[PDB]
Write an enzyme that holds these catalytic residues in place. Structure first.
Site, PDB file in Angstrom:
ATOM      1  N   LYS A  69       5.491  69.861  21.156  1.00 53.80           N
ATOM      2  CA  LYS A  69       5.006  70.404  22.412  1.00 53.80           C
ATOM      3  C   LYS A  69       5.907  69.992  23.574  1.00 53.80           C
ATOM      4  O   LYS A  69       6.018  70.736  24.544  1.00 53.80           O
ATOM      5  CB  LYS A  69       3.554  69.977  22.668  1.00 53.80           C
ATOM      6  CG  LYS A  69       2.493  70.833  21.989  1.00 53.80           C
ATOM      7  CD  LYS A  69       1.075  70.315  22.157  1.00 53.80           C
ATOM      8  CE  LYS A  69       0.023  71.199  21.511  1.00 53.80           C
ATOM      9  NZ  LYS A  69      -0.244  72.433  22.295  1.00 53.80           N
ATOM     10  N   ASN A 114      -7.802  73.987  15.942  1.00 54.54           N
ATOM     11  CA  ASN A 114      -7.371  73.105  17.011  1.00 54.54           C
ATOM     12  C   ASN A 114      -7.908  73.624  18.338  1.00 54.54           C
ATOM     13  O   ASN A 114      -8.009  74.832  18.548  1.00 54.54           O
ATOM     14  CB  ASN A 114      -5.848  72.951  17.055  1.00 54.54           C
ATOM     15  CG  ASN A 114      -5.163  74.063  17.819  1.00 54.54           C
ATOM     16  OD1 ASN A 114      -5.051  74.000  19.044  1.00 54.54           O
ATOM     17  ND2 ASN A 114      -4.696  75.076  17.106  1.00 54.54           N
ATOM     18  N   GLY A 117      -5.858  72.370  24.044  1.00 55.85           N
ATOM     19  CA  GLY A 117      -6.017  72.739  25.441  1.00 55.85           C
ATOM     20  C   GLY A 117      -4.753  72.502  26.270  1.00 55.85           C
ATOM     21  O   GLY A 117      -4.849  72.066  27.414  1.00 55.85           O
ATOM     22  N   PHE A 118      -3.575  72.810  25.702  1.00 55.17           N
ATOM     23  CA  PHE A 118      -2.308  72.737  26.416  1.00 55.17           C
ATOM     24  C   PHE A 118      -2.064  71.336  26.982  1.00 55.17           C
ATOM     25  O   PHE A 118      -1.764  71.185  28.162  1.00 55.17           O
ATOM     26  CB  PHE A 118      -2.254  73.752  27.566  1.00 55.17           C
ATOM     27  CG  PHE A 118      -1.885  75.175  27.225  1.00 55.17           C
ATOM     28  CD1 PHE A 118      -1.328  75.530  26.003  1.00 55.17           C
ATOM     29  CD2 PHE A 118      -2.088  76.175  28.165  1.00 55.17           C
ATOM     30  CE1 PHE A 118      -1.010  76.851  25.727  1.00 55.17           C
ATOM     31  CE2 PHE A 118      -1.757  77.493  27.890  1.00 55.17           C
ATOM     32  CZ  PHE A 118      -1.227  77.828  26.665  1.00 55.17           C
ATOM     33  N   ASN A 181       3.116  82.831  26.636  1.00 55.84           N
ATOM     34  CA  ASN A 181       1.982  82.637  25.764  1.00 55.84           C
ATOM     35  C   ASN A 181       0.729  83.129  26.479  1.00 55.84           C
ATOM     36  O   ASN A 181       0.178  82.415  27.312  1.00 55.84           O
ATOM     37  CB  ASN A 181       1.889  81.170  25.356  1.00 55.84           C
ATOM     38  CG  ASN A 181       0.784  80.929  24.360  1.00 55.84           C
ATOM     39  OD1 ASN A 181       0.138  81.875  23.916  1.00 55.84           O
ATOM     40  ND2 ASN A 181       0.570  79.674  24.004  1.00 55.84           N
ATOM     41  N   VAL A 182       0.301  84.350  26.145  1.00 57.98           N
ATOM     42  CA  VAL A 182      -0.871  84.955  26.755  1.00 57.98           C
ATOM     43  C   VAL A 182      -2.034  84.938  25.759  1.00 57.98           C
ATOM     44  O   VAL A 182      -2.948  85.759  25.867  1.00 57.98           O
ATOM     45  CB  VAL A 182      -0.566  86.392  27.224  1.00 57.98           C
ATOM     46  CG1 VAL A 182       0.522  86.419  28.281  1.00 57.98           C
ATOM     47  CG2 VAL A 182      -0.200  87.318  26.069  1.00 57.98           C
ATOM     48  N   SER A 184      -3.285  81.717  23.881  1.00 57.57           N
ATOM     49  CA  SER A 184      -4.030  80.508  23.563  1.00 57.57           C
ATOM     50  C   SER A 184      -5.528  80.787  23.649  1.00 57.57           C
ATOM     51  O   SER A 184      -6.011  81.304  24.658  1.00 57.57           O
ATOM     52  CB  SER A 184      -3.678  79.351  24.454  1.00 57.57           C
ATOM     53  OG  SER A 184      -4.588  78.277  24.245  1.00 57.57           O
ATOM     54  N   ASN A 186      -7.744  78.507  23.968  1.00 55.80           N
ATOM     55  CA  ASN A 186      -8.283  77.224  24.396  1.00 55.80           C
ATOM     56  C   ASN A 186      -8.077  76.999  25.893  1.00 55.80           C
ATOM     57  O   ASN A 186      -8.347  75.907  26.389  1.00 55.80           O
ATOM     58  CB  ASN A 186      -7.665  76.078  23.589  1.00 55.80           C
ATOM     59  CG  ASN A 186      -7.843  76.267  22.098  1.00 55.80           C
ATOM     60  OD1 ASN A 186      -8.930  76.620  21.647  1.00 55.80           O
ATOM     61  ND2 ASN A 186      -6.784  76.065  21.331  1.00 55.80           N
ATOM     62  N   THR A 187      -7.595  78.022  26.607  1.00 50.18           N
ATOM     63  CA  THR A 187      -7.528  77.979  28.059  1.00 50.18           C
ATOM     64  C   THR A 187      -8.334  79.162  28.588  1.00 50.18           C
ATOM     65  O   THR A 187      -8.065  80.309  28.231  1.00 50.18           O
ATOM     66  CB  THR A 187      -6.072  77.920  28.550  1.00 50.18           C
ATOM     67  OG1 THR A 187      -5.573  76.609  28.277  1.00 50.18           O
ATOM     68  CG2 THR A 187      -5.914  78.205  30.030  1.00 50.18           C
ATOM     69  N   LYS A 224       3.765  86.334  23.264  1.00 49.15           N
ATOM     70  CA  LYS A 224       3.034  85.905  22.089  1.00 49.15           C
ATOM     71  C   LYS A 224       1.598  86.385  22.217  1.00 49.15           C
ATOM     72  O   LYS A 224       0.943  86.107  23.211  1.00 49.15           O
ATOM     73  CB  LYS A 224       3.077  84.384  21.928  1.00 49.15           C
ATOM     74  CG  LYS A 224       2.445  83.876  20.640  1.00 49.15           C
ATOM     75  CD  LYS A 224       2.857  82.468  20.292  1.00 49.15           C
ATOM     76  CE  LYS A 224       2.174  81.932  19.055  1.00 49.15           C
ATOM     77  NZ  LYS A 224       2.690  80.587  18.715  1.00 49.15           N
ATOM     78  N   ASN A 253      -0.704  84.245  17.478  1.00 51.49           N
ATOM     79  CA  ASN A 253      -1.322  82.953  17.745  1.00 51.49           C
ATOM     80  C   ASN A 253      -2.487  82.736  16.774  1.00 51.49           C
ATOM     81  O   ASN A 253      -2.705  83.524  15.859  1.00 51.49           O
ATOM     82  CB  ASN A 253      -1.796  82.876  19.201  1.00 51.49           C
ATOM     83  CG  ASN A 253      -1.617  81.508  19.824  1.00 51.49           C
ATOM     84  OD1 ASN A 253      -1.978  80.496  19.225  1.00 51.49           O
ATOM     85  ND2 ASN A 253      -1.049  81.461  21.022  1.00 51.49           N
TER      86      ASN A 253
END
Ligand SMILES: Cc1cc2nc3c(=O)[nH]c(=O)nc-3n(C[C@H](O)[C@H](O)[C@H](O)COP(=O)(O)O)c2cc1C
Ligand SMILES: Cc1cc2nc3c(=O)[nH]c(=O)nc-3n(C[C@H](O)[C@H](O)[C@H](O)COP(=O)(O)O)c2cc1C
Ligand SMILES: Nc1nc(-c2nn(Cc3ccccc3F)c3ncccc23)ncc1C1CC1
Ligand SMILES: Nc1nc(-c2nn(Cc3ccccc3F)c3ncccc23)ncc1C1CC1
Ligand SMILES: O=c1cc(C(O)O)[nH]c(=O)[nH]1
Ligand SMILES: O=c1cc(C(O)O)[nH]c(=O)[nH]1
Ligand SMILES: [Cl-]
Ligand SMILES: [Cl-]
Ligand SMILES: [Cl-]
Ligand SMILES: [Cl-]
EC number: 1.3.5.2
Lengths: 365, 365
Positions: A69, A114, A117-118, A181-182, A184, A186-187, A224, A253
């Protein structure tokens, strides 16, 4: 190899048993960054070479975002045998992400859930880390080992597009490609960036910042996407990508879906699901996006790859490159050489001259 | 082998191009029954032997129902290298099934859609056909090459349970196992036989007829289910199967679902979808049913198997045996030897002593 068998049978069952997934992750990153793991033996053949995104890739197998990361293990990952490395997601400001535990194994499903959360060291720290080895990377890239940087946004950001623009300006000059990254899970609010006018506005801004960099520092920009898009969403993304001349897609993702038949005790944990249960949902998204883009937009295929057949299915569906992550948590570093060896055998078997000939071959049947 | 490559690259593209799927099917059955196709070369190793359903299987790879509907090609199929053969579905009275065309290729998806509608020569004709070679089959069975018979019901039948009971009485004495097919998507009302009290009443009647046969003529009874069941449906089936002591499950029939990402022009044709798009939906059903039955009910896994990895995924999910059909329509007879060779290699690779050790191995992770 005996190592593939040693890791799969003995070492990996033991380590993953004694340590919680996140502890394992941190240790894996540490070992990789220190180069402690032996150098991958597999000699990359010419069949596996791919030219895409304005770059040569020595092999089409990369490490997906989420492992490294903060850009701490890049050189160790090339030593592991990956043809390219993607770091991130990196957010503008540092942030800690969600409270632990936030990663879960589903051994019976060869899957992981997972909700990190970035968690990110932030742009400045990563920038300095990459700058320390910038010229080293320049030579790696020229030798067919490119570096991608995956950009995220801060949890409390009031302007998503400015977060991505900051990333482009700071890390874009150090990257061979950037990933917006559009996708995730977890956000809060992030995947709604995949809508039409919002996505157009966002990617217009990203691409303007990119175009404003000096030529030798000007990366390809990829988007992504999630596997959980509607048909409308995918049509809209395809349309925007072609309108704006986005350089490629990463597909996909993790999924917020829970496919029927998951056996893991922890299957109802919140988060993105990865690994085998995601495989055919990734591959079908690749297939659709390839068709919607008329095969004219490079795709990096990712989701549940742990074999040469998995990789070649994605390639034949339309992927120019593939990434994996979750398979490492079950099989360890030997899986990389395994996938490449099997892929090479399958290409010969099915009468392809190389990876390049197999790209999108299912669509020409 | 060169034959695998010859069929996949040259012959199969040509034949399937010149003939409509149903014409191809009829020709394939004719060639097989005449034994025109060369005898499979692959020597079956001891690793591939399975003992289940009160029988030895020389290898775990069978031909699924729907290819040899009327029992015309049994001996040709053993020569092809299958470890077991399933004929049918057979209905009590002859019936023509649906109007043509009723079979469709989806080449881009390695899939087929069919709505044959239980075209059948009927019990009497099949009975006489099987009787002609009954003693030949007795020796094949003893040598590890069993024969299954898949039972259907007539379109205009007013009593489903009596149709299946007729089948048990007529073909049960000629079969090593019978399949109660409650999962055809192409007979109105049939899949509703998978409901609880209805299913209990039906299978109670089937099992009574079976138990009424003389001992040497007394087959195992399996139930074949669809991939499109709800979680409630699967729980109910699991419950009934254990209550009544059903001998096994076949998992799965074709799907009336159309997964996202199908590219074939004919993807919106009515019928059951088979082949690659069904693969992971079959495997996840196997996984669930295995768990619901505590691993105590043998499963025959079927759906989109065209490789050793496909086969071993089903085995590890809980299948004791696997069948394929659709892969033949794309790769031809060589696929059988391919699947067995790859399966054997993978078993050694992953440290299994044989097929038997791999059955349900994912559930013990
Ligand atoms: C623990 C973990 C963290 C991840 N973090 C990120 C991330 O920060 N950014 C991103 O774009 N994808 C992230 N991903 C998604 C992976 O890059 C990849 O798309 C997904 O896991 C599917 O590949 P796999 O099945 O081979 O793991 C993460 C996945 C996992 C398992
Ligand atoms: C043309 C065709 C006809 C079929 N007929 C039958 C049938 O009569 N009875 C049955 O139980 N299943 C039937 N099936 C289903 C297959 O036995 C099998 O369950 C399904 O095709 C999945 O396997 P595959 O993906 O390897 O083809 C048929 C399938 C096809 C493609
Ligand atoms: N649980 C996880 N495990 C791994 C992981 N383990 N190992 C084996 C291993 C080898 C050496 C030293 C310690 C080791 F743990 C890996 N080797 C290579 C790459 C990554 C790994 N990575 C991530 C995660 C979780 C976030 C999902
Ligand atoms: N379209 C279909 N094709 C096939 C099919 N073709 N071949 C090749 C082939 C070889 C030799 C002579 C003629 C041939 F056609 C097969 N070989 C072995 C088994 C089955 C096949 N079976 C079924 C169907 C449709 C209902 C779905
Ligand atoms: O893009 C992303 C980000 C994360 C995360 O939790 O940081 N997790 C994922 O599965 N995908
Ligand atoms: O069980 C069955 C029966 C048929 C048929 O149309 O006869 N088709 C399938 O796909 N499955
Ligand atoms: Cl300038
Ligand atoms: Cl649950
Ligand atoms: Cl008697
Ligand atoms: Cl359509």
């Amino acid at each position: 190899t005996g190592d593939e068998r040693f890791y799969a049978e003995h070492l990996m069952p033991t380590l993953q048993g004694l340590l919680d997934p996140e502890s394992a992750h941190r240790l894996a990153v540490r070992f990789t960054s220190l180069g402690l793991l032996p150098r991958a033996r597999f000699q990359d053949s010419d069949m596996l070479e791919v030219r895409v995104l304005g770059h040569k890739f020595r092999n089409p197998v990369g490490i997906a975002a989420g492992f490294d990361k903060h850009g701490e293990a890049v050189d160790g990952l090339y030593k592991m045998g990956f043809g390219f490395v993607e770091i991130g997601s990196v957010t503008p400001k540092p942030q800690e992400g969600n409270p632990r535990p936030r990663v879960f194994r589903l051994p019976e499903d060869q899957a992981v859930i997972n909700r990190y959360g970035f968690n990110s060291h932030g742009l400045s720290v990563v920038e300095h880390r990459l700058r320390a080895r910038q010229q080293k990377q320049a030579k790696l890239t020229e030798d067919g080992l490119p570096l991608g940087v995956n950009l995220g946004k801060n949890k409390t950001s009031v302007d998503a597009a400015e977060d991505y623009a900051e990333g482009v300006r700071v890390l874009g000059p150090l990257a061979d490609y950037l990933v917006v990254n559009v996708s995730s899970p977890n956000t809060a609010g992030l995947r709604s960036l995949q809508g039409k006018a919002e996505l157009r506005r966002l990617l217009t801004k990203v691409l303007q910042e990119r175009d404003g960099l000096r030529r030798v520092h000007r990366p390809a920009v990829l988007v992504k996407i999630a596997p959980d898009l509607t048909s409308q969403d995918k049509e809209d993304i395809a349309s925007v990508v072609k309108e704006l001349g986005i350089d490629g897609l990463i597909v996909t993702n993790t999924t917020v879906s829970r496919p029927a038949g998951l056996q893991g005790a922890l299957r109802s944990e919140t988060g993105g699901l990865s690994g085998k249960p995601l495989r055919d949902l990734s591959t079908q998204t690749i297939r659709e996006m390839y068709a919607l883009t008329q095969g004219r937009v490079p795709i990096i295929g990712v989701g549940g790859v742990s074999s040469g057949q998995d990789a070649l299915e994605k390639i034949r569906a339309g992927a120019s490159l593939v990434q994996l992550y979750t398979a490492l948590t079950f099989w360890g570093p030997p899986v990389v050489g395994k996938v490449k060896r099997e892929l090479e055998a399958l290409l010969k078997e099915q009468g392809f001259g190389g990876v390049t000939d197999a790209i999108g071959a299912d669509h020409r049947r």
